[PDB]
From a paper:
TTR is an extracellular soluble nonglycosylated tetrameric protein synthesized mainly in the liver, retinal pigment epithelium, pancreas, and choroid plexus. Extracellular misfolding and misassembly of TTR lead to the formation and accumulation of amyloid fibrils in a variety of tissues, which gives rise to distinct progressive clinical syndromes known as TTR-related amyloidosis. WT-TTR homotetramers or heterotetramers comprised of mutant and WT subunits dissociate into monomers, which can rapidly misfold and subsequently self-assemble into amyloid fibrils. It is well established that TTR tetramer dissociation is the rate-limiting step for amyloid fibril formation.
The presence of T119M in the heterotetramers reduces its dissociation rate and, consequently, the aggregation rate and amyloidogenesis progression. We also solved the crystal structure of the nonamyloidogenic variant T119M-TTR at 1.3 Å resolution at the same pH as a control. In our hands and in agreement with previous reports, Met at position 119 protects TTR from acid and urea-induced denaturation, by increasing the kinetic barrier of tetramer dissociation in these conditions. Noteworthy, the Gdm.HCl denaturation midpoint of T119M-TTR was lower than WT-TTR (Cm 4.3 vs. 5.1, respectively). One plausible explanation for this behavior is that the specific residue at position 119 may differently affect tetramer stabilization mediated by Cl−, although this effect should be further confirmed.
Residue numbers in the entry:
A (entry chain A), D (entry chain A): 10 to 125
B (entry chain B), C (entry chain B): 10 to 100, 103 to 125
Write the structure that this text describes.
């Protein structure tokens, strides 16, 4: 898995389930082009977004739709989403795990980058 | 001061000084319109971005230039920048804080009523 | 003010008010000796814990009573308290910040030189 | 695994490997009694600390020896360790994952609690 996203809920002490995630890649004309999307599973993880072949060098944006997540649990949160923007694969293929820990008025995000 | 931004450095345990911050407001065509900008002070804070008159309800984006901060320190970072996107609601002062590490950041909003 | 403690609430986006904070200093027999205490203010801050004369080099523990904070709000929390343990070094002011959620907390130290 | 500890390094974007972890349980006389210990693996995880039978109700303290970790990487960090203190199994057996994200002058800790 070259790109995996994991989301946790710091209010419940649980995976954040059914969180929508949209990935974009910056195009030549500097616009954000849709690249992949999905939703987190019961484990809070989203696998299978892309492949080694498709996940070329570029600048990527992972959008985690946190506001929709919170509202469905009865909470009106601060952020619209959590964005994670990074250059990927510029020194060759890597595996990326993007983690996000969510609270209504805060989030943390961490990346683990490993060489296959 | 309806909007203040504070940035901290978790590698050195210090304010993050001279960090560029850009604020955008979402326009009717869904594009991001430049709204305000500046650089953090020696206290890691950025004051005077906007005014009560000007800071109307809407969706705002605060972009914090973290990559350039780390690059100047000779540290290799993960993110291009940190982004904080939120809706301003009438019914208060917003403090957006960001705690920076090379491969992680934490952001928090403190919303208080005068 | 050589030591200040700030506590924030990530569920409500506010200062964490009236949080009990206890500071201990490690004694020669390795036990924790009560050193200072108080409750956070309406700004979530606790000032005046100690003085320059009294805050000598040594290992200190700051205990933040998070469980009681959440219980009063009717929210079920994970931790008994948050603990911040560190060595004071001569060669500055310490700000210990804690950002609280029911099953998580983040703590940060800002160490600055007058 | 009723109790697992996971540690990540926010400077390197990697698991925190070979981090010593000491677990204590509060005794009847309110002293901290040694309960289990170990070190994180190449994945940043520490498994096998205890068993369902041994991990009874109580107040537990997980000490993560962060200072020793940082010093060996050339960094003089702020904290002596990261402590995580919690009541466990007071409503029956649960599985606990304690995660810690480390920086030299900060850390985050999160617990995921699941019912078998």
């Amino acid at each position: 898995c070259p790109l995996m996203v994991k989301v946790l809920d710091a209010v419940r002490g649980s995976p954040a389930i059914n969180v929508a995630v949209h990935v974009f890649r910056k195009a030549a004309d500097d616009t954000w082009e849709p690249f992949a999307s999905g939703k987190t599973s019961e484990s809070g993880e989203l696998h299978g977004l892309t492949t080694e072949e498709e996940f070329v060098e570029g600048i990527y944006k992972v959008e985690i739709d946190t506001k929709s997540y919170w509202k469905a649990l009865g909470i009106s949160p601060f952020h619209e989403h959590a964005e994670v923007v990074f250059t990927a694969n510029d020194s060759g293929p890597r595996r990326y795990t993007i983690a996000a820990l969510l609270s209504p008025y805060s989030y943390s995000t961490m990346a683990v980058v490993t060489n296959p």
